[PDB]
Amino acid sequence: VMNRLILAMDLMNRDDALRVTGEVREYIDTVKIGYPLVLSEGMDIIAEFRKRFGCRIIAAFKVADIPETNEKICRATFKAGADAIIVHGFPGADSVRACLNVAEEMGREVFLLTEMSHPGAEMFIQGAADEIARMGVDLGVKNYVGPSTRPERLSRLREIIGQDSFLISPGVGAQGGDPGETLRFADAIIVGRSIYLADNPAAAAAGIIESIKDL
Amino acid sequence: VMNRLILAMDLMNRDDALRVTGEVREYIDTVKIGYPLVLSEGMDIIAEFRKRFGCRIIAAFKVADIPETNEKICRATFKAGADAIIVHGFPGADSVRACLNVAEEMGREVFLLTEMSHPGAEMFIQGAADEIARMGVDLGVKNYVGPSTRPERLSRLREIIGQDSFLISPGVGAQGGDPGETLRFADAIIVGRSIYLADNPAAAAAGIIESIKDL
């Protein structure tokens, strides 16, 4: 990923989302698009971004339904042009396998979300995260998502998935995570508000990258 | 809900979704619309269904993100016209509270999904479901979703939330759940494929209603 930085584009207006993404394009090559933007402007926004910015698009949907429904969501998401989709592991192996089957059919990728970055993740997810990560390895998952907010947990997740797996991590900036520390374990960091709510998004992204390049 | 029956409209074509819903409208008063249809035809489909059929719409999104993102998803969903939204409880209390805050602001409702109905739910969700249900009671949640496929778990969920709370239940038909048994604990059952993939959806819905009335 360019500069090891992925933009989480959660603005809910097509004009603002396009403007900010265009302003920071020279610093990234991958954009995370989630339901805030897709439910406000439509799934067609994914293809528009891919064409306009020529960036890879990760659909940040964190699918958490039954197998049959997860398949339908994956199919619609890849049909819309996404390069990858984020899937929750907590629902179990069959729900994750349904996503992997559609990705295989469509030539795309699945990112498995293990532990989440917000405070509430400590209640139920954290206690199952190591096992969710092992389930991922057993299913052949190669892409993972872990919390910038708990680098000790990110370290443990990296330990389970190995050095060969790709690990991206949200919670940098607004949620309290640090770019440099997170990158000791993750391959790339996800940044949303710290960049898209900034007065000058390009300068915010540039500053993050300057603190990264120094690693 | 009319006849204690909620249709899960997971067809991914507007024409087919409209046809089936119209054919069974005389038997239900509530339609569950999820991502398969919304990501395929757009969020405007919610208002169209509401107007066309004058039914209540439950957005079956099973939101499972951080608080800030969950708020945005709830806001877009209610702006689209949904009467209620289903939220996963496993992400923790702050994620659920974010949804409740938006529902309060917009005069809508939140349904808390505790234990899921598919086989994989046994891996991680089942072990935390009782606690997720208690968290719901503590937060003041009055609407819940529990599994038709495990009536002993549906019974335990009912025990935790009490008789005053509303409980709906998916997994009837295709997943193996039974209408009559599920209705011993849930207030209403959710049915998707058994009705929408049937050669005669109205006849399938009527047959289910017949079983229910007999209870």
Three-state SS annotation for chain B: CHHHEEEEECCCCHHHHHHHHHHHHHHCCEEEECHHHHHHHCCHHHHHHHHHHCCEEEEEEEECCCHHHHHHHHHHHHHCCCCEEEEECCCCHHHHHHHHHHHHHHCCEEEEECCCCCHHHHCCHHHHHHHHHHHHHHHCCCEEECCCCCHHHHHHHHHHHCCCCEEEECCECCCCECHHHHCCCCCEEEECHHHHCCCCHHHHHHHHHHHHHHC
Put simply, the answer to whether B66 touches A36 (Cβ < 8 Å) is no
- DSSP three-state, residue A86: strand
CB-nearest to A93 from B62, B120, B127 is B120
Put simply, the answer to whether A35 touches B123 (Cβ < 8 Å) is no
Structural contact between residues A49 and A56, judged by C-beta atoms closer than 8 angstroms: no
Q: Which residue type sits at A55?
A: C
Q: Which chain A positions have a beta carbon within 8 Å of B169's beta carbon?
A: none
Put simply, the answer to whether B76 touches A35 (Cβ < 8 Å) is yes
Put simply, the answer to whether A90 touches B94 (Cβ < 8 Å) is no
Angstrom distances, CA of residue B107 to CA of A177, B40, B73, B74, B81: 35, 27, 16, 12, 11
Q: Which two tokens stand for residue A34?
A: 């989630």
Q: What is the DSSP letter of A202?
A: H
CA A46/CA A34 separation, integer angstroms: 10
Give the strand pairing for B109-113 and B143-145.
Answer: parallel
Residues 6+ apart with CB under 8 A from A98: A67, A68, A70, A71, A74
Put simply, the answer to whether A120 touches B34 (Cβ < 8 Å) is no
Interface test mutation site (partner B, options A11, A72, A86, A99, max chain B beta carbons within 10 A):
A72
Structural contact between residues B130 and B112, judged by C-beta atoms closer than 8 angstroms: no
Catalytic residue status for A79: no
How many residue pairs bridge chain A and chain B with CB atoms within 8 Å of each other?
Answer: 135
CA B142/CA A122 separation, integer angstroms: 24
Q: Which residue type sits at B122?
A: E
CA B44/CA B82 separation, integer angstroms: 10
CA A128/CA A122 separation, integer angstroms: 10
CA A78/CA A141 separation, integer angstroms: 18
What is the experimental resolution, given in Å to one decimal place? 1.8
Backbone angles phi, psi at B85, to 5 degrees: -135, 140
**Which fold, B1-215?**
TIM Barrel (3.20.20)
Q: Which residue type sits at B71?
A: E
- DSSP three-state, residue A210: helix
Q: Which chain A positions have a beta carbon within 8 Å of B35's beta carbon?
A: 61, 65, 69, 72-73, 76
C-alpha dihedral over A44, B196, B108, A124, to 10 degrees? -80
Of B32, B62, B79, B142, catalytic: B62
Backbone angles phi, psi at B114, to 5 degrees: -100, -80
Put simply, the answer to whether A10 touches B69 (Cβ < 8 Å) is yes
- ∠ CA B152-B129-B38, rounded to 5°: 100
Closest CA in chain A for residue B124: A90
CB-nearest to A77 from B39, B93, B116 is B39
- DSSP three-state, residue A98: helix
Q: How many residues make up chain B in this entry?
A: 215
Closest CA in chain B for residue A89: B124
Angstrom distances, CA of residue B57 to CA of A46, B129, B132: 26, 25, 24
Q: Cα distance from B122 to chain A (closest Cα, Å)?
A: 7
C-alpha dihedral over A60, A66, A72, A76, to 10 degrees? -10
CB-nearest to A123 from B93, B118, B120 is B93
Structural contact between residues B4 and B31, judged by C-beta atoms closer than 8 angstroms: no
CB-nearest to A118 from B39, B95, B175 is B95
- ∠ CA A16-A22-A25, rounded to 5°: 135
Put simply, the answer to whether A92 touches B35 (Cβ < 8 Å) is no
CA A39/CA A19 separation, integer angstroms: 19
Backbone angles phi, psi at A44, to 5 degrees: -60, -20
CB-nearest to A36 from B64, B73, B132 is B73
Structural contact between residues A113 and A85, judged by C-beta atoms closer than 8 angstroms: no
Put simply, the answer to whether A35 touches B90 (Cβ < 8 Å) is no
Q: Which chain A positions have a beta carbon within 8 Å of B92's beta carbon?
A: 118-125
CA B31/CA B38 separation, integer angstroms: 13
Structural contact between residues A59 and A50, judged by C-beta atoms closer than 8 angstroms: no
H or E element in which residue A189 lies: strand A188-191
Of A32, A51, A62, A79, catalytic: A62
CA A128/CA A94 separation, integer angstroms: 16
